[PDB]
Design a protein around this ligand. Structure first.
Ligand SMILES: [Mg+2]
Ligand SMILES: [Mg+2]
Ligand SMILES: [Mg+2]
Ligand SMILES: [Mg+2]
Ligand SMILES: [Mg+2]
Ligand SMILES: [Mg+2]
Ligand SMILES: [Mg+2]
Ligand SMILES: [Mg+2]
Ligand SMILES: [Mg+2]
Ligand SMILES: [Mg+2]
Ligand SMILES: [Mg+2]
Ligand SMILES: [Mg+2]
Ligand SMILES: [Mg+2]
Ligand SMILES: [Mg+2]
Ligand SMILES: [Mg+2]
Ligand SMILES: [Mg+2]
Ligand SMILES: [Mg+2]
Ligand SMILES: [Mg+2]
Ligand SMILES: [Mg+2]
Ligand SMILES: [Mg+2]
Ligand SMILES: [Mg+2]
Ligand SMILES: [Mg+2]
Ligand SMILES: [Mg+2]
Ligand SMILES: [Mg+2]
Ligand SMILES: [Mg+2]
Ligand SMILES: [Mg+2]
Ligand SMILES: [Mg+2]
Ligand SMILES: [Mg+2]
Ligand SMILES: [Mg+2]
Ligand SMILES: [Mg+2]
Ligand SMILES: [Mg+2]
Ligand SMILES: [Mg+2]
Ligand SMILES: [Mg+2]
Ligand SMILES: [Mg+2]
Ligand SMILES: [Mg+2]
Ligand SMILES: [Mg+2]
Ligand SMILES: [Mg+2]
Ligand SMILES: [Mg+2]
Ligand SMILES: [Mg+2]
Ligand SMILES: [Mg+2]
Ligand SMILES: [Mg+2]
Ligand SMILES: [Mg+2]
Ligand SMILES: [Mg+2]
Ligand SMILES: [Mg+2]
Ligand SMILES: [Mg+2]
Ligand SMILES: [Mg+2]
Ligand SMILES: [Mg+2]
Ligand SMILES: [Mg+2]
Ligand SMILES: [Mg+2]
Ligand SMILES: [Zn+2]
Lengths: 146, 62, 37, 176, 214
RNA sequence: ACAGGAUAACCGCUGAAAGCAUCUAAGCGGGAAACCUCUUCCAAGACCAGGCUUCUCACCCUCUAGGAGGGAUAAGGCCCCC
RNA sequence: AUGGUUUGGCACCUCGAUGUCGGCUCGUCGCAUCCUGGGGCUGGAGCAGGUCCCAAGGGUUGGGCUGUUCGCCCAUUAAAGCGGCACGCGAGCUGGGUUUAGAACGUCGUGAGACAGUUCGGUCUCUAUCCGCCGCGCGCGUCAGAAGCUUGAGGAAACCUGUC
RNA sequence: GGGGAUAAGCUCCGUGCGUCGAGAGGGAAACAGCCCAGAUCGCCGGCUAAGGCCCCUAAGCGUGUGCUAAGUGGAAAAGGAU
């Protein structure tokens, strides 16, 4: 019998990650890995082992190429011809957090356990957060050289 | 689980397996995972063994 | 603004230039002005 | 590129201070500041000359060396003596004058047309249908020139409308 | 700035112009509104003024509502409704407990009046969305007056959310824009407006400076 | 509707690559019932369930003390009537 | 070369049932745009055109004739768009022809009958379970409980134009 | 290969062709017929084929050398282009 994690025995932790001048894709991938908890060696798909990750200053996120005017986030309200058209520039101008939020919702397991994990992520626009009472630990994403 | 443990110990799972084999260990991934979640100290020792058994150059054509 | 896929300098004076991928040719003779596409 | 390779000379009555990638040019006619593309650099020659430096021999540097050199030559020329762009209106009932910083025009439109002068540019009307524009920055001078040129549509038949000095208009006449 | 007032429709009438014409007009008794709260952006999230008007017996009014009014420092009001400001300029000229009257309006200013529409009850499609009635002879079979075809067929194979069909109509907020004002009362809070504003005699109407024209 | 912002096509200024020329690859501009707002309505089941006021804010019992089970109610709500 | 719309080929789905043309009501989408909007060029004096580019927001006749779709005609408007949507839509209606049973005409057949020739009349069923959709309610959660007021993510509505 | 138009998931032949039919498993999302490969049963063991190794999803956000600015990659021609 292998190991499966208990209900409350699982442990969380808080990290804050600035997004200034960070590549959107790489930041999203690292955030999703940490969110699901794959870094932890207690990972078990049925029960999340992730950590509350808080993203700060999300308006300065950067993307490669000329995407800044040719990325096309989509959605449809629900009625015929209710298709909605938007670009990264407009999205950042009007509601920034949505960019990273959509990026990571795409990565998370689209089942409901993933819909839940989605909760434990929070993204802000400016370099400040009312979550200062949880002592988040700065977490700069790095690669294992090889 | 093994990949998670190796990365937390600063090594990639494939390298852990390669070094472990090159050292000629006969333990399998079930025991690997159970240890990795039970005795991080033993997992650390095993990863040091794997790294030490890891040759100097990894890109050598030989 | 003659629009078509084959663009070529008409007289010895036309110029062929590029702009945002849409290659167009320009000349003092306004009639020559043609883009590609 | 090799256009920008030549050394741009600094006139005596000129001041230039550069920090980082930004540069500024001071003179009797005003001060202009611009930021150049990061990859290309530039040094201030001890002999009163301007030398723009391209860190590489590839696309960005090869293209931008001469670009920066010509931009600096243009801005130095503007801060030393400036530029002028005369504009004459040929046609009937075309009244053009200068009242203060703004401009009032009579181009035949049923409503009066007013153009607001951007800062740092000076105007003066010398003839009822002839006048010039005196400004420091070639960019603004040309921008205003084009803006007030476009207040009238192209005219091939009579050539009516505002036009530049050295501009000539093609002739066309219809039979019936 | 974006001033506002509540008021009641008590009837509606016509006046005879000095312009020598004739104009229908609605009686909107604009009782004196009372400011019972302030919306400071720094501490609430925006700028706006709280408003209340009317008279209710204290036993007819809820205890919490009475307490809130008392903390406001004004007598009880029959309902509560608050209008928004566009800048703190008009904000600084408003103060809790202040009384507001119809005087605020200078004649010649377009106005906007809005309030609950009439109670029409559940309505057939033809009346509701202005359909056309089918042929009532030549052989209709219990279909003289019903909607009829409703969408595509197997493509989209659905009924297209948004299709306008039968549904209880009326009795909801509605606004009429750009109504000319005609006469402002001062002594007894009355206001006369050209046209026919939505609502009902004894209904509640909120008036404000017109948006479109000014 | 007006107005505003970023655009289509289109029109441009200063510009080397390529001593020229060049609306452009650096930059800066104009540019339409098209897009986003502006106008009106719905709208915190927005599960990320928001924010602002005002009122009732402490009497018990018991089980076996771990938590839980049996009552007290006011603010207000319901029913009732017209 | 493109699209899959017309005439077509294949017979893979449906013969223990997939109702067919028009009309009526209702629409919905694409854009190869009919007008309205913005441009380039003219063999564009102007008005008025021609042509090509961007643009789908909105609007886009009524009658006489025939079952008609279509089309012609009359007379208007800025226009009277092209299409996709089971040649949109009969568990919403009509049955006018197509499409049974009578009869008849011409024609083929000695014949009985027949004729994508014509001509007259000829039963159109369903109380909505689910999805769907238009409205209106019940329960619970929003972390002590209540009455109010909201901010607004987020949806919806409207968006036409002539004449002087 | 015939016919069709070198069109059809078309039709008609040959294959000591293959597979499905009468075949489970993995890959190409989904997909008998295409690719890898034959399910006696069980094992909470290991090595591999095709295909893959940033996340959904297991595996290098690997090593070194070059190309691309087109989201080409991630639908297409005649022709055209400092
Ligand atoms: Mg009505
Ligand atoms: Mg009717
Ligand atoms: Mg009947
Ligand atoms: Mg009847
Ligand atoms: Mg040039
Ligand atoms: Mg030029
Ligand atoms: Mg809430
Ligand atoms: Mg009560
Ligand atoms: Mg068949
Ligand atoms: Mg079949
Ligand atoms: Mg069948
Ligand atoms: Mg049957
Ligand atoms: Mg049918
Ligand atoms: Mg049919
Ligand atoms: Mg088009
Ligand atoms: Mg036009
Ligand atoms: Mg034309
Ligand atoms: Mg169109
Ligand atoms: Mg529209
Ligand atoms: Mg259709
Ligand atoms: Mg049909
Ligand atoms: Mg239809
Ligand atoms: Mg159809
Ligand atoms: Mg039915
Ligand atoms: Mg049904
Ligand atoms: Mg029939
Ligand atoms: Mg018959
Ligand atoms: Mg018979
Ligand atoms: Mg005979
Ligand atoms: Mg015979
Ligand atoms: Mg009969
Ligand atoms: Mg029938
Ligand atoms: Mg029936
Ligand atoms: Mg039913
Ligand atoms: Mg909103
Ligand atoms: Mg063959
Ligand atoms: Mg066959
Ligand atoms: Mg077999
Ligand atoms: Mg198989
Ligand atoms: Mg599979
Ligand atoms: Mg076997
Ligand atoms: Mg999955
Ligand atoms: Mg993985
Ligand atoms: Mg590799
Ligand atoms: Mg690498
Ligand atoms: Mg290399
Ligand atoms: Mg592709
Ligand atoms: Mg190609
Ligand atoms: Mg060629
Ligand atoms: Zn030419």
């Amino acid at each position: 019998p292998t190991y499966t994690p208990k209900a409350g025995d699982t442990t969380r932790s808080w990290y804050v990650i600035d997004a200034s001048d960070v590549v959107l894709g790489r930041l999203a991938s690292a955030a999703a890995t940490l969110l699901r908890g794959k870094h932890k060696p207690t990972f078990t798909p049925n029960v999340d082992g992730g950590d509350f990750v808080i993203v700060i200053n999300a308006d300065k996120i950067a993307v490669s190429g000329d995407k800044l005017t040719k990325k096309f986030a989509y959605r449809h309200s629900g009625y015929p011809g209710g298709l909605r058209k938007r670009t990264i520039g407009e999205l950042l101008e009007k509601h920034p957090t949505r960019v990273v939020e959509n990026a990571i919702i795409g990565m998370l397991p689209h089942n409901k356990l993933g819909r839940q994990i989605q909760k434990k992520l929070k993204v802000y626009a400016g370099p400040d957060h009312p979550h200062a009472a949880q002592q988040p630990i700065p977490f700069e994403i790095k690669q294992v050289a090889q | 689980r093994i990949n998670a443990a190796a990365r937390a110990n600063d090594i990639t799972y494939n390298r852990l397996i390669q070094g472990l084999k090159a050292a000629g260990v006969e333990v399998d991934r079930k025991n690997l995972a159970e240890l990795a979640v039970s005795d991080p100290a033993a997992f650390t020792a095993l990863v040091d063994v794997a790294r030490a058994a890891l040759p100097e150059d990894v890109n050598a054509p030989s | 603004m003659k629009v078509n896929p084959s663009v070529k300098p008409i007289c010895d004076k036309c110029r062929v230039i590029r702009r945002h991928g849409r290659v167009m040719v320009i000349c003092s003779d306004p009639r020559h002005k043609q883009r590609q596409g | 590129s090799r256009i920008g390779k030549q050394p741009v000379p600094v006139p005596s009555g000129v001041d230039v201070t550069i920090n980082g990638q930004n540069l500024s040019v001071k003179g009797p006619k005003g001060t202009l500041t611009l930021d150049v593309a990061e990859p290309i650099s530039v040094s201030r020659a001890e002999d009163g000359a301007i030398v723009v430096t391209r860190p590489d021999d590839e696309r960005r540097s090869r293209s931008l060396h001469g670009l920066s050199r010509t931009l600096i030559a243009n801005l130095v020329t503007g801060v030393t003596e400036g530029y002028t762009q005369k504009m004459e209106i040929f046609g009937v009932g075309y009244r053009v004058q200068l009242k203060g910083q703004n401009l009032e025009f009579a181009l035949g439109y049923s409503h009066p047309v007013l153009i607001e002068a951007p800062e740092g540019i000076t105007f003066a009307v010398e003839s009822p249908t002839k006048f010039s524009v005196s400004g420091i920055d070639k960019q603004k001078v040309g921008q205003i020139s084009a803006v007030i040129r476009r207040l009238r549509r192209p005219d091939p038949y009579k050539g009516k409308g505002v036009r530049y000095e050295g501009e000539q208009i093609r002739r066309k006449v219809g039979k019936t | 700035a974006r001033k506002g007032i509540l008021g009641t429709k008590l009837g509606m009438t016509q006046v005879f112009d000095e312009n020598n014409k004739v104009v229908p007009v609605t009686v909107v008794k604009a009782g004196p509104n009372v400011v019972t709260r302030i919306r400071t952006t720094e501490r609430d999230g925006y700028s706006a003024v709280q408003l209340a008007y009317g008279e209710i017996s204290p036993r007819k009014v809820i205890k919490p509502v009475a307490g809130q009014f008392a903390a406001a420092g004004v007598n009880p009001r029959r309902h509560v409704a608050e209008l928004r400001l566009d800048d703190e300029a008009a904000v600084a000229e408003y103060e809790v407990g202040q009384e507001l009257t119809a005087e605020i309006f200078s004649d010649g200013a377009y106005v906007d009046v809005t309030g609950t529409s009439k109670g029409k009850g559940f309505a057939g499609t033809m009346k509701r969305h202005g359909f056309r009635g089918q042929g009532a002879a030549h052989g209709a079979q219990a279909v003289h007056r019903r909607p009829g075809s409703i969408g595509g067929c197997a493509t989209p194979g659905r009924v297209f959310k948004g299709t306008r069909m039968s549904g209880r109509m009326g009795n909801d907020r509605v606004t009429t824009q750009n109504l000319k004002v005609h006469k402002v009362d001062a002594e007894n809070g009355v206001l006369l407006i050209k046209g026919a504003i939505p609502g009902r005699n004894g209904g509640l109407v909120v008036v404000r400076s017109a948006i479109k024209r000014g």
